[PDB]
């Protein structure tokens, strides 16, 4: 549902300022986060990809081979309201995106591609929250 996806979004973005400081990222990535869930908005900046990668790593969502860690993704989803079914459905969407995306040597671009594919799948399910919820109050 959009309500669960809002909560997952807020919690995924809570480390954004921490990741920006660790990576010395520029403020020109901020608008991409404010617009993350805006339908048809494409993020193209690889630096925003690096940030998304870091946010995933903060939640232990990347396994030792650079692919989704299903168990930790499931645990994250379920803490914030997903039942086992929704958790599985979310993980399957991300896995499906990993397998469909044009492959990329650059992890920041790979992550970006997976995020954009995932976003489109969530819109297709009518589960997208408001556009700006990943940021929450983290940049205020
Ligand atoms: C688990 C996500 C649920 C709600 C909102 C945002 C999640 C961020 C979507 C990006 C997915 C990152 C997967 C690629 C990680 C690099 O291997």
Domain ranges, ordered by start, for the chain: 1-140
CA distance 2 to 99: 25
Please report which helix (H) or strand (E) contains residue 132, including its range: none
Quote the ligand 1 centre to 115 CA distance (angstroms).
6
What angle do the packed helices 84-100 and 70-79 form, to 10 degrees?
140
CA dist 59 and 76 (Å) reads 8
Residue 39's SS3 state is: coil
Tell me if 86 CB under 6 Å of ligand 1.
no
Q: Degrees (nearest 5) of the Cα angle 38, 35, 113?
A: 80
Quick check: 43 and 120 in contact, CB under 8 A?
no
Please state whether 8 falls in left (phi above 0), alpha (psi between -120 and 50) or beta.
alpha
Name which residue sits closest to atom 5 of ligand 1, judged by CA: 9
Please give, one letter per residue, the 3-state secondary structure of 44-106: CCHHHHHHHHHHHHHCCCECCCCCECHHHHHHHHHHCCCCHHHHHHHHHHHHHHHHHCCCCCC
- Environment class of residue 20 by beta-carbon count within 10 Å: exposed (0-12), middle (13-18) or buried (19+)? buried
Which CATH homologous superfamily contains domain 1-140?
Answer: Pheromone/general odorant binding protein domain (1.10.238.20)
Breaks (C-N over 2.5 A) in the chain follow: none
- Residue 16 in 3-state DSSP? helix
CA of 77, closest atom in ligand 1: 1
Distance from the alpha carbon of residue 32 to the mean position of ligand 1, in angstroms: 15
Helix and strand numbers (H, E) in the chain are 7, 0
Q: Does residue 131 sit in helix, strand or coil? A: coil
Pocket test for ligand 1, best of 97, 115, 127 (most atoms within 8 A of CB): 115
- Nearest residue to 34 (alpha-carbon basis) of 126, 139, 114, 112: 139
- 109 Cβ closer than 6 Å to some ligand 1 atom: no
| Resolution of the experimental structure, in angstroms | 1.1
List C-alpha distances in Å: 69 to 15, 33, 90, 133.
19, 23, 12, 24
């Amino acid at each position: 549902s959009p309500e669960i996806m809002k909560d997952l979004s807020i919690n995924f973005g809570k480390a954004l300022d921490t990741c920006k400081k660790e990576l010395d990222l520029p403020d020109s990535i901020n608008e991409d986060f404010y617009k993350f869930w805006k339908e048809d908005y494409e993020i193209t900046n690889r630096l925003t990809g690096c940030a998304i990668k870091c946010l995933s790593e903060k939640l232990e969502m990347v396994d030792a081979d650079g692919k989704l860690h299903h168990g930790n993704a499931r645990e994250f989803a379920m803490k914030h309201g997903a039942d086992d079914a929704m958790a599985k459905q979310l993980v399957d969407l991300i896995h499906g995106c990993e397998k469909s995306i044009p492959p990329n040597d650059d992890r920041c671009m790979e992550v970006l591609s997976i995020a954009m594919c995932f976003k489109k799948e969530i819109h297709n399910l009518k589960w997208a929250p408001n556009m700006e919820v990943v940021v929450g109050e983290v940049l205020a």
